[PDB]
Design a protein around this ligand. Sequence first.
Ligand code: HEM
Length: 154
Amino acid sequence: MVLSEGEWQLVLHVWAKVEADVAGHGQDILIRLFKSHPETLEKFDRVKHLKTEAEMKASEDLKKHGVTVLTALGAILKKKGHHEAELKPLAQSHATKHKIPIKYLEFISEAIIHVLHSRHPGNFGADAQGAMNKALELFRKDIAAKYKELGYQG
Ligand code: HEM
């Protein structure tokens, strides 16, 4: 699949807002992920013991994790589809070290869309959401192809 420049512009325009507060968006997204799909929390040894949203909101480790995910994702989106180099080390660590099934990448995709929708209604209408979904699907498709080459494709 391939996105048009118009679709990339919609994605990057809302992302510019996310970047005004990377830590805040990272927390919201991870908390949304962990509450909607608790099984995912088990993958994070440094934060799996957190029982409530209040504990999550106060966690310094959770906030650092959020910044890391959004910074790596942002670097990928800014490549506008030319992200093969950025995807390799990422696919290897999630396939071989962490063992993250594609299904969980779909779950975090949902959390991202949910949060942008809440915090940026004016820059996240239907067209912009369609573009973001398309960009995240592109990301998932390429990652899963890499998973298979690496022997996981879980
Ligand atoms: C847009 C999605 C994702 C991006 C861009 C991403 C990115 C990263 C990055 C940059 C790291 C740092 C170094 C490394 O590769 O180990 C990392 C670590 C990790 N990722 Fe992700 N990740 C994503 C989704 C997920 C999801 C959905 C899960 C689990 C449900 C996950 C679990 C992990 C774990 C377990 C680690 C290591 C945490 C630790 O240091 O203890 N990742 N990820």
